[PDB]
């Protein structure tokens, strides 16, 4: 905001993807697809966490047979989340053999590096595109440098070698990835697949490379782009790498749906990737999913236990109130609340939030000004400052986000 | 890498900051500075975690008296980490009254919005600059939009109003922040402070604004820049916002030292901010601090418990081996290890790492190829695949990062 790269709109089920539409969050299950109970449950969990589209692997016949049942069960729950089928090597076979699965999916993902080789590859690709066209389904053509077509790389390495100034092998691999996606995009369009039925991706695992790749894809094609840093890994590394890779592109207006490719720790839920995706988009002002807290790090000017506990309590309370607030108070997802440690940046940061509190740091009288809408609202003192503040936030929301219209 | 914005070199103690030098990680204590034992311990903890420079608040007389003792104790431990003193409102008084503190610090931080007002402000600023010059200390002039000089904003709001096409109030606040830093920079230089003694910052709490601000600062000044998203907040939000704000600038070559402004949860250590800072710089290929793991998210094609546990074990083992490895094997900090869930992207991603393993996913024979230096090394099978792989990684490191020269 802004400006978005303009693109045609591609509907993935009821969710529109493209330049005129909010950037969508999506995620992918990790249960065996043949396990209908486990996969249905996880799709629900991911959707409830904020995944607007959910992808599942459709890797073998047993998975393919399961898809119509999963979709049936989701619909029985009144949940219309679009499902993307992830196909590799035998997608043409499964789509051919299981038309009920083909119809149940809301989008097909093809990888131009896992279609086979030679004219087998061309025919496999054409069959899947033909099936999509016949059913009116959209397709993501998704290249990944982990599965890059070796024949194409060879072609480009030779082209490069003849150049007056040849590029490194690494630059050529990135070129080939882009070329793999662009050639398949152009082929699909030439076969009759609509511009309203084509999404592209070309993922790599390092941020700097990803920025290069998606700038090229954005320039060379008109399609909405599925953006993600592939194989981002574990823990803080996976979170940081993902945000670092996506933000430069998103700030330039590139990307129409995102997925965060975290490796879960055994103890953490699959939904973490959805939480990260939401935070990336909200950090950049591109979506508003829920209220957020701006808080200083705290330093020697404030008492650490009190301040850290206050900031945590405020974050926890906003999370708890949200289901009620969403129902009563349109627009509350945009709420910004500040919790600040001392007079140095307290009042100023608080006056930039919708409502904020500045605690007394060292050398200050034990009172805590509260600011709302850019000016002083009141001053709190004594015990229970946390609870008094949260009541003020509650009152603030009731008034600022009152419905009607 | 690249290209860095060129800047003169500013030494903060023994650490050089500037375009010719690696981007430094720093952090700030949150213990009361007057508490010598607590603050000395935390500086050590932050330095041991990777903080190359450490800042502490010097907020009152009791803090000021403590600084020489903290520095003495650090030196007794053989630890030469540079200390930055953070001054607000009374910095001129503390530096005047406690020359031993002024000498003990390796850098002074001034905030042009916490100097006072009117010609008092000018004189306070001049006194601190004069003290730095006399002691040969460098200075960070650090503006923060949480403490923006109201007189300057008023000046610019009037300038804006007279324009043919006035900007929003928000754009003007950002303009004023930049102007506050630039005017103080130019004043300091005019007083005789060397270009080798001046670092600048101008922090705001939203990523998109920060990118704007630092692009302006980079254009209008020649100083090395201390880059950070101020008041980033808690949890995943704080991590993501910080990475999203910094990466666009770092990829453009802007920024010579960084600090990540996380609010700690009560149960998490202050060192988390250092871990995040390291991951941002390493994600962008600007520093190498330690080996890292590239791993897929896992999906229905692989068994989740086995794969997630393997990837975790590998990450844990690299962390455990690092102290030994650093001593024996120069350059090992650059090691990239892949752990992949199935044949779709396993081999290709693994061939982009120094060494990687591709597990058997569904429909594959129960064996696991290992790749090193871009080609197949061997194939593992049976129980104990994790341990066999880690021995191969150990052997790989011994050979690829052998010393000598
Ligand atoms: C499932 C895979 C298969 O190509 O999907 P992509 O969209 O290429 O990338 P990502 O979302 O990182 O998931 C892992 C990949 O293996
Ligand atoms: C300590 C403060 C004081 O201005 O320092 P800055 O460098 O402005 O910003 P940050 O590093 O986010 O720390 C919090 C600020 O209050
Ligand atoms: S606002 Fe005050 S307490 Fe918070 S980090 Fe800044 S100086 Fe320290
Ligand atoms: S590499 Fe295989 S197991 Fe890992 S996410 Fe990709 S398809 Fe799934
Ligand atoms: Cl997805
Ligand atoms: Cl999981
Ligand atoms: Cl710092
Ligand atoms: Cl802490
Ligand atoms: K898990
Ligand atoms: K803590």
Contact A96, A66 (CB under 8 A): no
Which of A323, A311, A249, A318 shows the shortest CA–CA distance to A286? A249
Whether A298 is in the pocket of ligand 3, judged by its Cβ within 6 Å, is yes
Residue B297's φ and ψ, nearest 5 degrees, are -70, -20
Residues ≥6 apart with Cβ < 8 Å to B184: B110, B112, B125, B141, B143
Which of B239, B138, B233 shows the shortest CA–CA distance to B193? B138
Whether B358 is in the pocket of ligand 4, judged by its Cβ within 6 Å, is no
Pairwise CA distance, residues A152 & A183, whole Å? 10
Residues ≥6 apart with Cβ < 8 Å to A154: none
Cα B204 to Cα A314, B57, B107, B126, B385: the distances in Å are 21, 20, 22, 25, 49
Contact B345, A230 (CB under 8 A): yes
Residues with Cβ–ion distance below 5 A, ligand 8: B 264, 270
Domain(s) labelled CATH 3.20.20.20 in chain B stretch across: 1-287
Q: Do B30 and A299 touch (CB under 8 A)?
A: yes
Residues ≥6 apart with Cβ < 8 Å to A136: A197
Pairwise CA distance, residues A374 & A377, whole Å? 9
Contact A173, A156 (CB under 8 A): no
Helices marked H in B201-340 — which ranges?
207-220, 235-251, 272-283, 304-328
Residue A279 annotated as binding site: no
Whether B341 is in the pocket of ligand 4, judged by its Cβ within 6 Å, is yes
User: Which single residue is written with the structure tokens 């592109």?
Assistant: A249
Residues ≥6 apart with Cβ < 8 Å to B7: B18, B19, B20, B222, B223, B224, B225, B256
The DSSP H or E segment spanning A16 is strand A15-17
Pairwise CA distance, residues A27 & A85, whole Å? 12
Residues ≥6 apart with Cβ < 8 Å to A182: A217, A220, A221
Whether residue B39 lies within 8 A of chain A, CB to CB, comes out as yes
How many angstroms separate the alpha carbon of residue A27 from the centre of ligand 5?
A: 4
What is the best residue among B184, B202, B203, B225 to mutate for testing ligand 2's pocket, by most ligand atoms within 8 Å of CB?
B203
Query: How long, in residues, is chain B?
Result: 405
Contacts of A233 in chain B (CB under 8 A): 292-295, 311
Q: Which residues of A154-187 are buried (b: 16+ CB within 10 A; e: fewer)?
A: eebbeebeeeeeeeeeeebbbbbbbbbbbebbeb
- Distance from the B120 Cα atom to the nearest Cα atom in chain A, whole angstroms: 18
Dihedral, B111, B115, B117, B119 alpha carbons, nearest 10: -110
Cis peptide before B306 (omega within 30 of 0): no
Which of B2, B18, B28, B1 shows the shortest CA–CA distance to B259? B28
DSSP assignments along B327-358, one per residue: HHSTTGGG-EEEEESSTTTHHHHHHHSSEEEE
Q: Which atom of ligand 4 is nearest to the CA of B342?
A: 2
Pairwise CA distance, residues A359 & A307, whole Å? 8
Contact A332, B271 (CB under 8 A): no
Residue from the list B28, B247, B315 with its beta carbon closest to the beta carbon of A299: B28
Please tell me whether residue A283 adopts helix, strand or coil conformation.
helix
Contact A29, A58 (CB under 8 A): no
Helices marked H in A302-345 — which ranges?
304-328
Contact A280, A257 (CB under 8 A): no
Neighbours of B69 (CB within 10 A): 16
Contact B209, B174 (CB under 8 A): yes
The DSSP H or E segment spanning A15 is strand A15-17
| Assigned superfamily of A1-287 | Dihydropteroate synthase-like (3.20.20.20)
Helix/strand/coil percent split, chain A, to 5:
50, 20, 35
- The pocket around ligand 1, CB under 6 angstroms, is made up of A 86, 111, 142, 144, 201, 203, 228, 230-231, 259, 261; B 296-297, 299, 344-345
**B374, burial (CB in 10 Å: exposed 0-12, middle 13-18, buried 19+):** exposed
Tokens of B300: 């229905």
How many angstroms separate the alpha carbon of residue A304 from the centre of ligand 8?
A: 7
Q: Do B57 and A245 touch (CB under 8 A)?
A: no
Residue B53's φ and ψ, nearest 5 degrees, are -135, 145
Cα B299 to Cα A29, A73, A79, A239, B342: the distances in Å are 6, 21, 22, 18, 9
Strand partners, A258: A25, A227
Neighbours of B391 (CB within 10 A): 11
Residue A86's φ and ψ, nearest 5 degrees, are -100, 110
Q: Is the dihedral of CA B262, B264, B268, B270 positive or negative?
A: positive
Contact A402, A329 (CB under 8 A): yes
Which of A147, A146, A91 shows the shortest CA–CA distance to A124? A91
Q: Number of C-alpha atoms within 13 angstroms, CB side, residue B234?
A: 24
Which of B361, B307, B344, B338 shows the shortest CA–CA distance to A86? B344
Q: Do B295 and A63 touch (CB under 8 A)?
A: no
Strand partners, A85: A56, A108
Dihedral, A67, A39, A270, B380 alpha carbons, nearest 10: -90
Contact A116, A128 (CB under 8 A): no
Of chain A residues 332-351, which have a CB less than 8 A from chain B? Answer: 338-340, 344-349
| Assigned superfamily of A288-405 | Sulfite Reductase Hemoprotein, domain 1 (3.30.413.10)
Nearest-CA residue for atom 14 of ligand 2: A296
Q: Do A148 and B251 touch (CB under 8 A)?
A: no
Whether B344 is in the pocket of ligand 4, judged by its Cβ within 6 Å, is yes
Contacts of B236 in chain A (CB under 8 A): 239, 272, 275-276, 279
Cα B383 to Cα A246, B362, B366, B380, B395: the distances in Å are 39, 18, 10, 9, 20
Pairwise CA distance, residues A76 & A69, whole Å? 11
Q: Which atom of ligand 2 is nearest to the CA of A299?
A: 1
Contact A7, A101 (CB under 8 A): no
């Amino acid at each position: 905001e802004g400006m978005r790269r303009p693109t045609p709109t591609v509907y993935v089920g009821r969710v529109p993807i493209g330049g005129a539409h909010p950037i969508a969050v999506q995620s992918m299950t990790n249960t065996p697809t043949r396990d209908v109970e486990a996969t249905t449950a996880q799709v629900l969990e991911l959707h409830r966490a904020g995944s607007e589209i959910v992808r599942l692997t459709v890797n073998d016949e047993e998975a393919a047979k399961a898809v119509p049942e999963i979709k049936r069960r989701l619909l029985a729950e009144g949940v219309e989340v679009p499902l993307v089928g992830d196909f590799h090597f035998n997608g043409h076979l499964l789509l051919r053999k299981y038309p009920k699965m083909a119809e149940a999916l809301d989008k097909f993902r093809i990888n131009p590096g896992t279609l086979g080789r030679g004219r087998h590859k061309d025919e496999h690709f054409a069959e899947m595109i033909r099936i999509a066209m016949d059913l009116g389904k959209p397709v993501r053509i998704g290249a990944n440098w982990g599965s890059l077509d070796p024949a194409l790389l060879t072609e480009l390495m030779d082209r490069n070698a003849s150049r007056p100034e040849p590029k490194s092998a690494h630059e050529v691999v990135l070129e080939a990835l882009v070329e793999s996606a662009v050639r398949a995009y152009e082929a699909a369009l030439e076969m009759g697949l609509g511009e309203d039925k084509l999404v592209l991706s070309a993922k790599v695992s390092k941020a700097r490379d990803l920025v290069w790749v998606y700038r090229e894809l954005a320039r060379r094609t008109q399609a909405p782009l599925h953006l993600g840093l592939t194989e981002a890994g574990m823990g803080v590394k996976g979170i940081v790498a993902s945000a670092a890779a996506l933000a430069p592109l998103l700030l330039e207006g590139i990307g129409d749906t995102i997925r965060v490719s975290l490796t879960p720790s055994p103890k953490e839920p699959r939904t973490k990737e959805v939480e990260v995706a939401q935070e990336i988009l909200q950090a950049l002002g591109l979506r508003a999913f829920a209220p957020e807290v701006t808080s200083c790090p705290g330093c020697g000017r404030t008492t650490s236990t009190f301040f850290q506990e206050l900031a945590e309590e405020v974050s926890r309370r906003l999370k708890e109130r949200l289901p009620e607030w969403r129902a009563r108070y349109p627009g509350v997802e945009e709420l910004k609340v500040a919790v600040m440690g001392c007079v140095v940046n307290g009042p100023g940061e608080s006056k930039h939030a919708h409502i904020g509190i500045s605690l007394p740091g060292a050398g200050e009288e034990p009172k805590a000004p509260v600011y709302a809408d850019g000016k002083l609202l009141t001053i709190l003192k004594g015990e229970g400052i946390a609870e008094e503040f949260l009541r003020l936030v509650e009152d603030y929301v009731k008034t600022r986000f009152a419905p009607k219209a």
